[PDB]
Symmetry: D2
Subunit: 125 residues, 4 copies
């Protein structure tokens, strides 16, 4: 009974996609988004709420949470749902220092379609 669903991100729009933008000299930038190939809805009633990034350096006994991004605006206003003109898209950039290569894991949440995860390898050298 696994809560964190996984799939091919080219076929399933809910999967968080991890992209290593740079990993030069211990300086790391990692972009994570939901709906890269197929866009996910972002309305007052249906949206991605957050992405969390976890990094486990090779040989490390435990993983470390790198950070978490909340996407809080989804068009709600006093004029009703989907009227504010403000919608936060589910994409986040995490910049961090690291001394070793390791494993990246991302988790994301859709308010109606449950929890999701994805993985990538971080190579420094």
């Amino acid at each position: 009974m696994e809560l964190f669903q996984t799939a091919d991100w080219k076929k399933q729009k809910h999967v968080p996609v991890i992209e290593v933008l740079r990993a030069e000299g211990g300086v790391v930038e990692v972009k994570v988004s939901v709906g890269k190939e197929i866009p996910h809805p972002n309305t007052t009633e249906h949206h991605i709420a957050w992405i969390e990034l976890v990094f486990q350096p090779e040989g490390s006994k435990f993983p470390y949470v790198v950070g978490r991004a909340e996407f809080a605006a989804h068009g709600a206003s006093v004029d009703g749902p989907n009227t504010s003109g403000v919608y936060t898209d589910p994409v986040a950039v995490f910049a961090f220092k690291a001394e070793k290569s390791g494993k990246l894991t991302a988790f994301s949440y859709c308010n109606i379609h449950g929890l999701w995860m994805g993985e990538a390898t971080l190579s420094l050298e």
Copy 2:
């Protein structure tokens, strides 16, 4: 008396700095960071824990939280403080649909130096 401290970011390394990077297809990309000009420490004992971004479109009576970024790694491990080699930089990028100009406000928190605020204008026309 205010909880939220403000200052010249050229002199003070705590003020969150707001940078509007791009605006295409109805989406705006806003980078927020602490320590852009003068790096704030990131140790187990002393670090920026999060940044939160708020946007109030012109003509809107209320502001909207766009999002929040937590910076969760600060070097802690079973081997002691500042030993994990993983340190999350206090920088975030928020992408959000916006249709109007208005005011951006960013809040940030240092675990020992209290709460901070920065402001900028989003100009769409």
Copy 3:
């Protein structure tokens, strides 16, 4: 100012701070929005979070104690207000304090902006 501190005629948004206990520095604080008169909780209108800050009397800086997010507002694949799961905007923060001082709570309504409440923590 972004942080509103006074309620309207019919709608209460100001976070209410209650010190449940405080013996020997072992402290429990309940923060709520709309405990007497409920604030709406729908997909379209809800309190999203409460954050509690504490500044001990001698401290130059305040500390965040904690933050509670209220994440369920009834949305499901069957549509809004069909999940039957709705998180009330109430939190209990338990913490150690060695000194008296000032409590500040912040909260956010997704359509009614940002709010601030204040109370004193007295240990003796």
Copy 4:
């Protein structure tokens, strides 16, 4: 494997413990804590950062996040680690409405001992 470690909370104090305080007239209150019977340390260098509660109603294909509590103070101050006098206990109370019984899952995080989970049944009637 899985990033979320589990165990008998009586033997492993990292495991989040779910206590259903009430579950009567649609009205549910649930206490979740780490270190219920055996306290987990709370120091600047080593502490529980957050707990997240998840609920999946019987017959619901997807789980829902009920809420998330962050425990942000760990004694840090301008005078050094473990000097502030302010430490947030990793205990949270989630009050929520439910229409059906189901499965509660809690997630928690220790800054040095990785990610943890616990489970409990919610019976309404």
